A paper describes a structure:
The first enzyme in the pathway, peptide O-xylosyltransferase (XT, EC 2.4.2.26), catalyzes the transfer of xylose from uridine diphosphate (UDP)-α-D-xylose onto serine and thus determines the site(s) of GAG attachment on the core protein. XT1 and XT2 are type II transmembrane proteins consisting of a short amino-terminal region facing the cytosol, a single transmembrane helix, a stem region required for Golgi localization (Schön et al., 2006), a catalytic GT-A domain (Lairson et al., 2008, Müller et al., 2006), and a unique C-terminal domain of unknown function, termed “Xylo_C” in the Pfam database (Finn et al., 2008). XT1 has a two-lobed structure, with one lobe comprising the catalytic GT-A domain and the other comprising the Xylo_C domain. To better understand the initial step of GAG biosynthesis, we have determined crystal structures of human XT1 complexed with UDP-xylose and various PG-derived acceptor peptides.
We obtained crystals of a human XT1 construct spanning residues 232–959 and determined its structure at 1.9-Å resolution. Inspection of the GT active site revealed patchy electron density for a co-purified, unidentified ligand. To obtain defined complexes, we used crystal soaking to replace the co-purified ligand with dodecapeptides derived from the PGs bikunin and syndecan 1.
Numbering used by the authors: 253 to 309, 313 to 729, 735 to 959
Write the structure that this text describes.
Amino acid sequence: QPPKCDISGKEAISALSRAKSKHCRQEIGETYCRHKLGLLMPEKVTRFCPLEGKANKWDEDSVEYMPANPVRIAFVLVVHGRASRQLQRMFKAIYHKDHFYYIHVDKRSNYLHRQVLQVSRQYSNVRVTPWRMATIWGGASLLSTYLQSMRDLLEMTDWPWDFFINLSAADYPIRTNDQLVAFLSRYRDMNFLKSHGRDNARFIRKQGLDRLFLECDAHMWRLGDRRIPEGIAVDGGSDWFLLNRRFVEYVTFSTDDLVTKMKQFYSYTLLPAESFFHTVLENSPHCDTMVDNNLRITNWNRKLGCKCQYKHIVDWCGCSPNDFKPQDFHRFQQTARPTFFARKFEAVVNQEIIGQLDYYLYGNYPAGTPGLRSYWENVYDEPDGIHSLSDVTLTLYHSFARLGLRRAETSLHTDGENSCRYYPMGHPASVHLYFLADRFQGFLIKHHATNLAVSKLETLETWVMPKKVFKIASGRLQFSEVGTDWDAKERLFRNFGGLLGPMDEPVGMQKWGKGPNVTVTVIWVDPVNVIAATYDILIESTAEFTHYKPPLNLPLRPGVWTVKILHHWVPVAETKFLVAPLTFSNRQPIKPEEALKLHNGPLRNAYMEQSFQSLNPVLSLPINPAQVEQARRNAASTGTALEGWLDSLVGGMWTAMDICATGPTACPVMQTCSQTAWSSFSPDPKSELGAVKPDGRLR
Ligand SMILES: *[C@@H]1O[C@H](CO)[C@@H](O)[C@H](O)[C@H]1NC(C)=O
Ligand code: NA
């Protein structure tokens, strides 16, 4: 169907041409045409503040007194992702029985929501939002989430709260609850918001406040220009704040000119929570309550955090803070200004700094407490279904489980019946990442299998760990790795296991120490010694990481690839990586014609237009005609033959470290999972939540 008005703006045309759903196209057009007539945005707004401008209203010993009328705090936790045990650890740190906790879990994070429900069922002062939005980065929906949660909280008459504080799963306190309550009790009529403080016209342009945006199909579309309304001062800064009940009441229930028109304006705004509350407060009757300090330390690093990493999500470029590391601990003790929270923290990136901070605030755990240096994070959970996995991860998780079953059989030494022989049943039940002392240890896979001696089903967990493959030879090179999903801000691969299939596009990374600039040669070698790519790269004196994604035609030949680094044909180092053949297509066993198309190498017979056959003799990489033919045979296989090819490849690159039983077992040499040090079933008291103590705490 055609639009209600001629659509000629280049930005709107670009959005309409990229939008996937008919609903989104119609809403894009409806929004554009409304604005074109001048009926969508306000252009003049009343200012109620009696001040000429802004108001901008520290002794370390002032947070040590004991208040007679302590504030009660409503924490709104806006969380997403997989890091449930870290969220539980932070919740333990900030919990007190006289506060309140209201938890919004991103609609797309169903595993995390199930874990949060278990928390809300234990404690009367914890509730979960029954509505759930998909709060994409920069989305307008983040303000809708805050405004709805404020209305909900104001109508819970059994929760008499005095302040509203927002936190994510990557936040952590840097002072005790006692000190937070003492400080807020002394300034209970103030509002804590941090402004950019620099040139305001530049802030408006950098933020895109003079641009019209629309959130639809989990994307933020830019649709054109708009005027800043006259009569008000527009301000902004951090979207992390603390607001008192009186101002939250005004924002929620006022119908005056300011609140009404700003709610309309910010419904079509990028990063609305970074400026909506500043602009309303400063122009409201409450303007003289504003303190230019959000009581947070935010770990900005412009060199690493501003790589326009959200381009596929919003029609704009943005920045995000870095994760703290152990060398940052001294920053949590600064004395310039009062601060009570900090971000960001990620246990999969660095857990040591989280431990240092928690023990600093609340003391060591007793000697003999297990799991303090470990971290477990669920990356697949059965209720979400195998269609939420990929064919690559479904194939490999199956193979890891079979590797565990083979370890159980070979671990029993006996000349009679082997009561540790198993037959696998069904699909993996769960998968965890496992870390120890900030070193990746591999995957834990929970699975079901029949013990063949007694003919009974058993539930097991297998630990698999990747074999070391980086090898140096007689420079500033420290490490080399191949992977996917490179995180330029944290400088690591978010595909932690390096799981790859024939249609993946691998990335080569190098890590360097200090020294003078140098140039090296990178060579990619496929499983039958076909040289797929060669290139030189400059390593500047100041470079720490380098990475590059060669344009290799697909599919890649399955097997063990090798990536070599040379310095003027002198060997430097090498690493290896596995392109796995897939046993599933659309989560069903792969058929002969599917496998042949997928497993016989690139459709162009060559990985790139330029050939490197003249290099094979130079590097002693002869192509064996027998191995080439065997790869053709392997490509046509399915079923049991294909399973044997896959498992021999996986076994060459992964080790089954151990396997345990969750319940009873007829295998005499298998340990109970809860009694191991490594299982996701073993004790982890730092993330466990129990009964409330006499002092009202869980920690
Ligand atoms: C480093 O770079 C400079 C120019 O930037 C170049 O002249 C020099 O040859 C390079 N290598 C060394 C060791 O200086
Ligand atoms: Na509850």
